[PDB]
Amino acid sequence: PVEFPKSLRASSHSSEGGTTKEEDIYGYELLYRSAFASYIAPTGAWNLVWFQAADGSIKQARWYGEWVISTVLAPGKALQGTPLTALLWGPQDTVRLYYLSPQFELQEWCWDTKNGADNKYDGALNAAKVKVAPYSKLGAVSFGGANLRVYYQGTNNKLEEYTFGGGQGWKKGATLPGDPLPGTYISFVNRNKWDANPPSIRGYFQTVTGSLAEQVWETGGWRIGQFVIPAAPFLTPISATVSPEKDFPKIHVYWLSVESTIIESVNWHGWKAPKQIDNISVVKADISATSFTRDDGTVDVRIYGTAQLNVLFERIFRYGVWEEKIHSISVGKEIPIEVVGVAA
Amino acid sequence: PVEFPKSLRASSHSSEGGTTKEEDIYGYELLYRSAFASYIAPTGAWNLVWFQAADGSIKQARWYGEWVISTVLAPGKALQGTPLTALLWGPQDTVRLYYLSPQFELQEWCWDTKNGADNKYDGALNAAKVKVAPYSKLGAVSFGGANLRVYYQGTNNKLEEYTFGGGQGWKKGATLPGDPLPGTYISFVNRNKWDANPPSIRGYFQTVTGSLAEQVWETGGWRIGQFVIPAAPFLTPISATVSPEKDFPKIHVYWLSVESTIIESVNWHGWKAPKQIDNISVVKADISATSFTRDDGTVDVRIYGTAQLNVLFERIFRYGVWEEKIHSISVGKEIPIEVVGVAAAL
Ligand SMILES: CO[C@@H]1O[C@@H](C)[C@@H](O)[C@@H](O)[C@@H]1O
Ligand SMILES: CO[C@@H]1O[C@@H](C)[C@@H](O)[C@@H](O)[C@@H]1O
Ligand SMILES: CO[C@@H]1O[C@@H](C)[C@@H](O)[C@@H](O)[C@@H]1O
Ligand SMILES: CO[C@@H]1O[C@@H](C)[C@@H](O)[C@@H](O)[C@@H]1O
Ligand SMILES: CO[C@@H]1O[C@@H](C)[C@@H](O)[C@@H](O)[C@@H]1O
Ligand SMILES: CO[C@@H]1O[C@@H](C)[C@@H](O)[C@@H](O)[C@@H]1O
């Protein structure tokens, strides 16, 4: 068997006090510690997830009655271990996926379906040849339709912005305040509606002290926000999502604890105390959260990431509860392995 | 501060029962979880270590009175996150470094220094365009001078061999027995002297059950060896090295515990019980061990890898003891970060 810390739970079927003996799955055609991007349709009618396969291609999992896997970027287009982040607007007929080339330049994949089209192509961002820090992660928001903002870590480790819209093409945007940890995960959201202008932007990242911090944009410029977590694991994965709950934006910020369990902090008329959403230890690796608002004004959340041993998980917050059944999305060949809990 | 499990020790200055509050170093120009290759000179006169920088280049650290850092492969030569393994013979004037291209093909870097040379160049292996499983690790041994064997994981997850020597060029070699874990770390050693023929080859890897296992080559062919660890962490780093102790090959095999502490098994007139060499938790990431025999008959060991938070460590076994001073080799810009030991999630 493989050995696992006895005090941690590897799966939903692990014993209540930790792992004793169980079977878990190794999906070896998923890149170990793959990045993830995702977007659930604002209607909730379908789901999109993107990930990196072991062969380096970027693939897509789409749920529409059932999960279907496809390849969107051939092997060689993306850095091995590229970050990923996605945009969806129109309200839901135009998709952009951002990633890094093997030369650490920002890249954009475009999928247009407006008016029955089905066009997939390399976006104009590629031609700006924007070199980033080689360990940079990626965030992005959209507003007013096709006004786009891409967030990255520059070669001097500051967080940087690239902008698109209003006929200007891609141009360098703001240099953000704060002192980001080199290689920090980053996640940016827009609290205002996809077709609204101006946006209301929040980004989440880890500072050089290890704390978690917040970027704020409102009319008037960029500011460091009130969201402060004094200590977090080194290079903890971070992902945030926002959707209106009872007509007010509900920000969900997720990161990993020292036990590699998912911690959630909610902003909705103020910040709520952080809370562990479940006590199952995921693989310390990228997570991706997305959300939508139902007809009665409640907000659903999905989180994608890597579970033991190398499985694409989907955690579901629906009708006000985290579902104890954690879904898995098969992306290729798999082998089952016995896992035994071992103490120090 | 950054949070670290309270029951683990992040460095040698951590408190005795685990981490309380301390300062640690993040070297951010070292690729996080870099691969490592290494070789100490058989005379012990100098050390070589290879690693991947954050920008994807492959760099070398060379100790000869002091550490000197150089770049040996420019950005774009290697897969980001490439495995690394090195050979040294002549007894110590010919170096080869194996890595993967961004297209998952075996690549070879050559450094020849015999007779005053300083020649660095791409090897003939590159032109063979050998495609490997994209998560393949790499091992290698040499014998009879320039007879070379490179070990990798094929697309069907079996361990495979490529051969060089005897005027034949690079050719496909054996398919090895056993059922290797996809993406297993692998480490191969030659128990016989560099100029001797036949060799005596041992390889260490992790199986689909999670156990650790051993490949054996002697005259007659390959077989599965008697070294068995029934359970180990998923995709645990593995590194082995061998050097003669009292005219008998002494194999050291290293892997990580669930606490990410380094475990050692020795083979020297039989396998000894596995034992933790120290209780400091390294980053769960590639390690590289090398060894040589002093002219008094005793075997020194060096181990390189990633320590908290991201620094290149050197652990030293010298004159029969693991030295308490665990060195760090700076490879670029660094920032100090405060680390606090934390018991629960919140
Ligand atoms: C029409 O241009 C395409 O769509 C825009 C919204 C941008 O994503 C641009 O980079 C892309 O090439
Ligand atoms: C109006 O200002 C522009 O758009 C805002 C939404 C921000 O992206 C800002 O950095 C940018 O300069
Ligand atoms: C007004 O406060 C700002 O906006 C809120 C929605 C939060 O993002 C808060 O952390 C931030 O400082
Ligand atoms: C002279 O040839 C060089 O040395 C041999 C030992 C091999 O490493 C070969 O691939 C390399 O090109
Ligand atoms: C003589 O046989 C060749 O040399 C041995 C040392 C092994 O490398 C074997 O796989 C190879 O076929
Ligand atoms: C003869 O036995 C073989 O050689 C020994 C040196 C060990 O490597 C052992 O595990 C292996 O089975």
CATH number at residue A108: 2.120.10.70
CA angle B320–B323–B325, rounded 5-degree value = 170
What are the phi and psi torsion angles at B3 (to 5°)?
Answer: -90, 135
Cβ-nearest to A1 among B54, B209, B337: B209
CB A127 near ligand 1, within 6 Å = no
CB contact under 8 A, A80 and B75: no
Tokens found for residue A248: 């007010």
**Cα-to-centroid distance, B87 and ligand 5 (Å):** 17
CB contact under 8 A, A183 and B28: yes
CB contact under 8 A, A258 and B345: yes
Tokens found for residue A335: 């082998």
DSSP helix/strand/coil, B61: strand
Cβ-nearest to B337 among A210, A339, A340: A210
Judge whether A212 and A238 are in contact, CB under 8 Å: yes
Among A7, A30, A77, A80, the strongest candidate for a mutation testing the B interface, having the largest count of B CBs within 10 A, is A80
Question: How many beta carbons lie within 10 A of that of residue B112, not counting itself?
Answer: 15
Full residue range of the structural domain in which residue A29 is found: 2-342
Question: How many beta carbons lie within 10 A of that of residue B90, not counting itself?
Answer: 16
The chain A residue lying nearest B81, using CA atoms, is A80
List strands edge to edge, sheet with B94-100.
Answer: B85-89, B94-100, B106-112, B119-122
Tokens found for residue A294: 């139902």
Residue position matching structure tokens 């080339």: A101
Tokens found for residue A195: 């077709």
CB contact under 8 A, A344 and B258: yes
Which residues make Cβ contacts (< 8 Å) with residue B183, sequence separation at least 6?
A28, A32, B133, B135, B136, B137, B153, B235
DSSP 8-class letter at B283? P
DSSP helix/strand/coil, A205: strand
Distance in angstroms (rounded) separating the CA atoms of residues A312 and A63:
14
* Residues of chain B neighbouring A279 (CB-CB closer than 8 A): 345
CB contact under 8 A, A233 and B2: yes
Name which of A267, A274, A278, A264 is nearest A313 in CA terms.
A278
Distance in angstroms (rounded) separating the CA atoms of residues B56 and B79:
7
Distance in angstroms (rounded) separating the CA atoms of residues A81 and A86:
16
CB A225 near ligand 3, within 6 Å = yes
Q: Provide the terminal-to-terminal Cα distance of chain B, rounded to the nearest Å.
A: 15
Q: In A295-310, which positions are buried (b, 16+ CB within 10 angstroms) versus exposed (e)?
A: eeeebbbbbbbbbbbb
CB contact under 8 A, A258 and B230: no
Chain A: nearest CA to B5, how far in angstroms?
6
DSSP 8-class letter at A16? T
The chain B residue lying nearest A53, using CA atoms, is B134
Nearest CA to ligand 1 atom 3: A123
What are the phi and psi torsion angles at B153 (to 5°)?
Answer: -110, 120
Report the Cα A202 to chain-centroid distance in Å.
14
Which residues make Cβ contacts (< 8 Å) with residue B118, sequence separation at least 6?
none
> Which run of H or of E encompasses B143?
strand B139-143
Report the Cα A31 to chain-centroid distance in Å.
16
Distance in angstroms (rounded) separating the CA atoms of residues B31 and B262:
21
Which residues make Cβ contacts (< 8 Å) with residue B168, sequence separation at least 6?
none
* Residues of chain A neighbouring B104 (CB-CB closer than 8 A): 55-56
CB A227 near ligand 3, within 6 Å = yes
> Which run of H or of E encompasses B128?
helix B125-128
Size of the A and B interface in Cβ pairs below 8 Å: 142
Name which of B89, B87, B84, B135 is nearest B107 in CA terms.
B84
Tokens found for residue B16: 């005795």
List strands edge to edge, sheet with A47-52.
Answer: A36-40, A47-52, A58-63, A67-73
CB contact under 8 A, A344 and B81: no
DSSP helix/strand/coil, A18: coil
CA angle B132–B136–B138, rounded 5-degree value = 100
Tokens found for residue A219: 């009319």
Cβ-nearest to A232 among B3, B80, B338: B3
Do strands A288-293 and A321-322 pair parallel, antiparallel, or not at all (unpaired)? unpaired
Name which of A82, A164, A77, A160 is nearest A122 in CA terms.
A77
Number of domains in chain A: 1
CB contact under 8 A, B335 and A274: no
Distance in angstroms (rounded) separating the CA atoms of residues B149 and B170:
9
Chain B: nearest CA to A77, how far in angstroms?
10
Q: Which atom of ligand 3 is nearest to the CA of A202?
A: 8
Which residues make Cβ contacts (< 8 Å) with residue B20, sequence separation at least 6?
B6, B14, B340, B341
Judge whether B53 and B70 are in contact, CB under 8 Å: no
What are the pocket residues of ligand 6 if the criterion is a CB atom closer than 6 Å to any ligand atom?
B 202, 214, 216, 225-227, 267
> Which run of H or of E encompasses B126?
helix B125-128
CA distances from A119 to A110, A116, B64 (A): 8, 10, 59
DSSP helix/strand/coil, B188: strand
Do strands B232-233 and B238-244 pair parallel, antiparallel, or not at all (unpaired)? unpaired
CA distances from A147 to A41, A162, A165, B281 (A): 19, 11, 4, 47
List strands edge to edge, sheet with B212-218.
Answer: B186-190, B201-206, B212-218, B221-224
How deeply is A163 buried, as exposed, middle or buried, from its count of CB atoms within 10 A (0-12, 13-18, 19+)? middle
Residue position matching structure tokens 């515990």: B257
CB A233 near ligand 2, within 6 Å = no
Distance in angstroms (rounded) separating the CA atoms of residues B225 and B223:
6
Q: In B279-308, which positions are buried (b, 16+ CB within 10 angstroms) versus exposed (e)?
A: bbbbbbbbbbbbbbbeeeeebbbbbbbbbb
Chain B: nearest CA to A231, how far in angstroms?
5
Strand partners, A288: A304
Tokens found for residue B136: 């393949």
Sign of CA dihedral A335, A336, A341, B2: positive
Distance in angstroms (rounded) separating the CA atoms of residues A24 and B235:
14
* Residues of chain B neighbouring A133 (CB-CB closer than 8 A): 54
The chain B residue lying nearest A55, using CA atoms, is B134
Which residues make Cβ contacts (< 8 Å) with residue B92, sequence separation at least 6?
B41, B42, B43
